[PDB]
Write a protein that binds this DNA or RNA. Sequence first.
RNA 1: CCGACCCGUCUUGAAACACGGACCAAGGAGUCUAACACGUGCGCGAGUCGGGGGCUCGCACGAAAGCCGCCGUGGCGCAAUGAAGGUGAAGGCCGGCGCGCUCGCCGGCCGAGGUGGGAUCCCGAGGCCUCUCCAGUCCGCCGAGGGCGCACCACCGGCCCG
Lengths: 125, 147, 187, 225, 48, 159
Amino acid sequence: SAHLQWMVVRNCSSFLIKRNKQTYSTEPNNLKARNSFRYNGLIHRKTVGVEPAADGKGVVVVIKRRSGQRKPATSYVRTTINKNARATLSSIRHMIRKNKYRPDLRMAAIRRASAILRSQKPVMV
Amino acid sequence: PSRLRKTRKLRGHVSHGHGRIGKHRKHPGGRGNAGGLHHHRINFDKYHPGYFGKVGMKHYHLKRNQSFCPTVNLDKLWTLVSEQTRVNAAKNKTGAAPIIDVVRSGYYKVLGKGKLPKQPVIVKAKFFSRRAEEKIKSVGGACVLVA
Amino acid sequence: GVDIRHNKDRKVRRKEPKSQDIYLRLLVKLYRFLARRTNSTFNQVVLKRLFMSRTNRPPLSLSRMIRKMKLPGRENKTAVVVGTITDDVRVQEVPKLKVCALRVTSRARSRILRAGGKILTFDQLALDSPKGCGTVLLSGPRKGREVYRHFGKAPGTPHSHTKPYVRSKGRKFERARGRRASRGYKN
Amino acid sequence: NFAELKIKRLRKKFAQKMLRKARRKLIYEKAKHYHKEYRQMYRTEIRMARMARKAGNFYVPAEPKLAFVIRIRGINGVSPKVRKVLQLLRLRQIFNGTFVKLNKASINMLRIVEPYIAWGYPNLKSVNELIYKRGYGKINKKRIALTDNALIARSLGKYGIICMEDLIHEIYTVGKRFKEANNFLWPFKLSSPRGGMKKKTTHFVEGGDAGNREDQINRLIRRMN
Amino acid sequence: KAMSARAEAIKALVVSRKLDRLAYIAHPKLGKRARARIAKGLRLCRPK
Amino acid sequence: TNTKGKRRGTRYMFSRPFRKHGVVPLATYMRIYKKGDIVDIKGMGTVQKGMPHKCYHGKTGRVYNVTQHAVGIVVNKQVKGKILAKRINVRIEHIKHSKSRDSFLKRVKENDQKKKEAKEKGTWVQLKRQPAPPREAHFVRTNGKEPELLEPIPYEFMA
RNA sequence: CCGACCCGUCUUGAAACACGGACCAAGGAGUCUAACACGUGCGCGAGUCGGGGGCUCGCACGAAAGCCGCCGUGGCGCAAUGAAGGUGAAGGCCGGCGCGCUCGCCGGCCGAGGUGGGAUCCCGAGGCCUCUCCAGUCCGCCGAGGGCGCACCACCGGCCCG
Ligand SMILES: [Mg+2]
Ligand SMILES: [Mg+2]
Ligand SMILES: [Mg+2]
Ligand SMILES: [Mg+2]
Ligand SMILES: [Mg+2]
Ligand SMILES: [Mg+2]
Ligand SMILES: [Mg+2]
Ligand SMILES: [Mg+2]
Ligand SMILES: [Mg+2]
Ligand SMILES: [Mg+2]
Ligand SMILES: [Mg+2]
Ligand SMILES: [Mg+2]
Ligand SMILES: [Mg+2]
Ligand SMILES: [Mg+2]
Ligand SMILES: [Mg+2]
Ligand SMILES: [Mg+2]
Ligand SMILES: [Mg+2]
Ligand SMILES: [Mg+2]
Ligand SMILES: [Mg+2]
Ligand SMILES: [Mg+2]
């Protein structure tokens, strides 16, 4: 279960980082990268994560499917969104709210999507 | 684990958990059970009555195997046989009481603590007690002896 | 300053299970929420007894539990014990028992199920009766440990029936002076 | 169904608002009656003495039954008997204040702590200033500032005390539930007396500050708080 | 025989005051219709 | 230093009152004692048998055992920092009924009847005994007589 | 400018006209074993434990780990008391008979007794409801009282051995 796995790895995981009175986790499907039961990307039956695309343009939204709860090769479905900012946020919001896929992660994923999208325009001096 | 002891927490403290005044000397008040009659008479008498002196007959070359006589109570009696053994005799219309050998199970004396289930049962033992023989005879069971 | 005495300010009581068992902590998490968000004091008694040590959660013999269940006015009630259920080989006719417990001996478990009983864990009991309705909250003998025989007054004092500490039992070990009038006294 | 449940909730809120209006009007009128009661006593005491002087006799006023006790000395070097009495009066700090109902038992208790206390007979105004400014209710073993009338109702409504004016009346005129009312009040933590004391180590009658000053406690209260 | 003897003995049968009124109105249960009556008198208006 | 004798320092304690020697009055032997009653240990020195110890002299205890010539009394004796209930076998000459308990039963019998009587005829009556209240206001007349002036007397050498 | 005696140590009392300390770097002091006792954690549970031995490619790890069960011998516990011969832990209720003689043989049930407290649980009079009333269905909440009483305490009983 989600909680049972959480109590195992709440303080014993390779992704866990503890430094300067802070706690962070680096699993690939973690929004905000903090170590918490809510934001853990590997112990839940359904998770969603936002990552930059392979090139320096667009984002990749990855979700966990309901059948592959034990088969990591086909556990996740990935897609790449490379439209304008306002439209891109709408799709992520719609895939969370309308799909009702972990609705608490709505604003967290959008903020992470906002950070990634703004990280791809040319840097200023 | 060294890291879990008072020594790691008593660094910097001059007396190290033994007092500036009385300190931790080598052996105050004697070594071992010293002065069990003179200055530790109170502690020995308070916590260990009967400590000093001889009582009874000393017996040379005591062999514990001669006195070896394991006991068993009546409440634990039916645990020696299988579960199938008791129910089969319980449901049987014929008065076929099963045979139980506590010597086979490893007991020599059958004590009479508890109460027996209402069914006859034959007990073979080297020894019995008066109440154990009483209770067994009450439920239709008989007592026999072995050597 | 004020005239108050600080030696009793910190109440010495358990707040969480000292054990690191995730399974125990998980059901503690469940009942901690249950105790906070309901009115039934049965949750709090169960919750605080989960914090207790093994010695404070003594095993419950099967014979003792059956005796309590057979008492009048307790029929069709779910027995609850926070600890280990222990089989007793001194009882034969096992009645149907709906019992919730933290741990049950396998031979105790097999006898109950063969007799038609029902076994539920504490999580299942929460789904059954969240308010603990229709439940009997039993416990094992807290003072049934051997250590309580030694506890009490000093053995040498008059009217003391406490077990002294001896490396062996025999006529040569702590029986002469102070135990019989033939040697000094008997007190 | 939205309008049906909305109407249900509007009926709930309106009735609750009307109930608060009923409660406020009762609080308003009870305070009004107390003000009538207060001025009745003030005029009666004068009128009773006035007719005595007309008759040529004397009118002894009733022995006052309410006293305010202020701890004046520190906590260093206190005999156990004195310390126990002070703790029974809930005066565990210097310049603490509490109200004591006066009788044979209480007076003898005050006699033991006479060097350590300064006590007198407060008037109406002194009680008003203490409760309104330094009033704290010991609610659920906690010192809560008496910022609303609802807090008193939650714990003293069973005794009929629901407003600050009710509390003042019970404190001033010793009522049936004075013990519950006064024990409900947290002990008053007064400041140091501005203008300085005369001498704390001697009785007031010998020019100091300890012991009993009958009506002069009102002078001390004004400087203290 | 003493319980029944006792039992038969048991069954051997067959101004305005404005401040007082205001407390009665302020009672959460006793004055429910009381404060309801004045509430409808504050909104509804009728001649005669 | 001090001797550990049983009767040390009881020269006045066990001494008879002045002009109270002689044969013991027989009312004490005619007293009847039950269990649970309260008695005061006097400890007269006329008869030396069954004498209570000096530490129990003047103390108050409750009887639990009765014999032909003595009673068993449970009494709270303070030792150092602890109080524990001692049992002492004391002959009846050294005890007497505690008048405090007898008056307490007198009040309770009065109190229960008062509750019974007042409830029957309707009224409410005070049961708890309040302490002495402050003295209420009262008038003091003069009857045409002035209060007498008092002047501190001048000092004179008494002797 | 204000306050500020040199630390460590023994002592009722140290800044002492008490002892040690010139300064600096490195080293330096409640450890391990055995036996107990208690508390805590874990597993099993009236049983528990293979630690000795044996069995598995002879061995980087692995001198580990795994397994034995007619390898549980054995240790500790499941019975105590007596010096020893030894002995050894079940009564409650209902019936006829001697004599229901303070009484023995049975019959039937039940299975560690009873008293007072005892968290908890159960029953529960009666109340809380809507725009309303007489008309009654479903469960929820508050609750005077009553009952079964965990562990534990105190006492009275009962049984075992000298
Ligand atoms: Mg220290
Ligand atoms: Mg010394
Ligand atoms: Mg000597
Ligand atoms: Mg402070
Ligand atoms: Mg302190
Ligand atoms: Mg001083
Ligand atoms: Mg000034
Ligand atoms: Mg002084
Ligand atoms: Mg020193
Ligand atoms: Mg020295
Ligand atoms: Mg000296
Ligand atoms: Mg000097
Ligand atoms: Mg020296
Ligand atoms: Mg030197
Ligand atoms: Mg170094
Ligand atoms: Mg191995
Ligand atoms: Mg063996
Ligand atoms: Mg051994
Ligand atoms: Mg009891
Ligand atoms: Mg007994």
